[PDB]
Every structure is written in structure tokens, then in C-alpha cells.
Design a protein around this ligand. Sequence first.
Ligand SMILES: CN(C)C[C@@H](O)COc1ccc(Nc2nccc(Nc3cc(Cl)ccc3Cl)n2)cc1
Length: 287
Amino acid sequence: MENFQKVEKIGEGTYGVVYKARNKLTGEVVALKKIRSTAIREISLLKELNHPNIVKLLDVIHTENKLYLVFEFLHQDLKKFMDASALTGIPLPLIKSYLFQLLQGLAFCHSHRVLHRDLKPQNLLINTEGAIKLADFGLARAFGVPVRTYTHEVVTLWYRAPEILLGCKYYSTAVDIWSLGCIFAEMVTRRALFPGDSEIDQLFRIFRTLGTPDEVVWPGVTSMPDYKPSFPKWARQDFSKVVPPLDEDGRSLLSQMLHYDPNKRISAKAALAHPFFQDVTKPVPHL
Ligand SMILES: CN(C)C[C@@H](O)COc1ccc(Nc2nccc(Nc3cc(Cl)ccc3Cl)n2)cc1
């Protein structure tokens, strides 16, 4: 915080404000997150979790009852890009490139047993080169995911996996695959897949599209903490209706990313080998 000159406020994260700043000694431009022992060790360990598709955590500065996290700076988030592309839509080749890169980032972190747990358009960052990176990876394990952010904003439930909503205490890396699948669908259709406004609304929106889960598709689901036998029983919808005009390879992949059973849900590694990526390229984004 000493060798940092604030340039401007970038926005507000889940835990603290984020500024674009310059290292007063190295001139390095960074994203500085300001948050007002176990958490410190946990976060400090993230400095070694480096990958091209993960926003680099340069440093962790604990001083004066404040925690500063210094990140590599990216010029924009995916949310802004999706909104700017609302009328025309993000070209499929670019959507495929982004999904491909995000899966590489997940595969890396998951190989080290680190999960994100709260993936959303606001923490997926992009540059003018065509790269996309995941930000805030690992912070959920250290701080937890609150109901409201430090500014009292509601933490979105739109990308939350069903096992979390049903009360599972030990989530797995599968929770991130679910979130990414929801984001994938959103990029394709230009509308959130499951825009719930409460935990039950979120759960029922999922149920209405994918069908109410039962022991057939998800062994043990009826014994989960928040599962209720009184849940309405909705029939599953054809994905052809859920994400048109995505082709069959894309629908196949999305379906596997949205499997109810965390055990059946495709892994990031397996997803990277899916036929959908056979013709993947790296386009330069227009905006
Ligand atoms: C209302 N409006 C100003 C909000 C958006 O446009 C905000 O646009 C931007 C513009 C640039 C960057 N770069 C960036 N680079 C590195 C880390 C990082 N972390 C981060 C930052 C915020 Cl703010 C929220 C959540 C996270 Cl995980 N952000 C991020 C968002």
C-alpha cells in the first residue's frame, strides 16, 4: 500500500474495493484489492498457483487491520463484454475460445485441489489479445462466500451448483464446472440460464429446465439436508430449446457440464478433450 499510487476505482468485489494502481517502485500497473491467520496462510499459498488463464496474485499485504491483494491487471470483465454484445452476440468461435481457456484454468486449479466456488461474469477477465482469465480463485475457501458483499450487494445465486443449494457441506471441483456451464449458456443465448432471486427460486428454475432430480439421476439426492419431498416434479426440457442455435457438440458438452450428480458431471480435463473443441481457435475480440 506504500509503493502503490491509486489511478482510479475499478469497482467493488465480494470482499473489498478494487483500484487500478501503479507500483511506485517498479512502475508496474496492477489491480489492488483492499479488504477491511488461517485465511492469510491460505491466500498466501495462492501466490504459487500460476497459470496463463488465472489472474496472477502478485502479492498479499497484511497491514493495519487491512488485507491488500495485488493482482495482475486486466482491462475488462466478461460481464461488460456480454452487455456490449447484447444486440449482436459474441461470435461462436470466440465463445468456444473463452470456454476452452476457462476450462484450462479450472483444470489447473483443480489439479492442485483448489476450487473457485463463485464463478460469474464479474470475475472472468479479458484482454484485447483474446485471452480470458479467472479471478478470485481460492478466496472462497479462505473467506467463505457471503450472502451479501462488503457493500451489501446480493451475491448472485445464478451460477450456484445444485448440491450447494441442497445443503451439501463438502462440495467438489464439480461446482465450478456447473458455474462455467451456466456462463457458457449465457454467452450463447445472451440471457442468464437460471436467473434465480432466492435459493428456492434458483433451485426451481434449475428443476423446471433440467427436471426435478430424483434417485434415478442423482443417487442420494433425497437425503440431502435441504431436499424436500414436497418439491414440485417438473419434466426435463430438450436442450435444443435451452440453448439454440448451439450445435450438437456444444449441447452435448453443456449437458454433461450440467449433470445433477457431481460424480457424473464432466471434469475440466475431460471437457477439454470433448469434440466441441476440435476446431477451437483464438480470435481477437472486437471490444
Ligand atoms: C460499474 N462498473 C464500473 C463495474 C465494471 O465495469 C468493472 O470493470 C472492470 C475493469 C477492469 C478489471 N480488472 C481486474 N484485473 C485484475 C483483477 C480484477 N478483480 C476484480 C475487480 C472488480 Cl471491480 C470486481 C471483481 C474482481 Cl475479481 N479486476 C475488472 C473489472
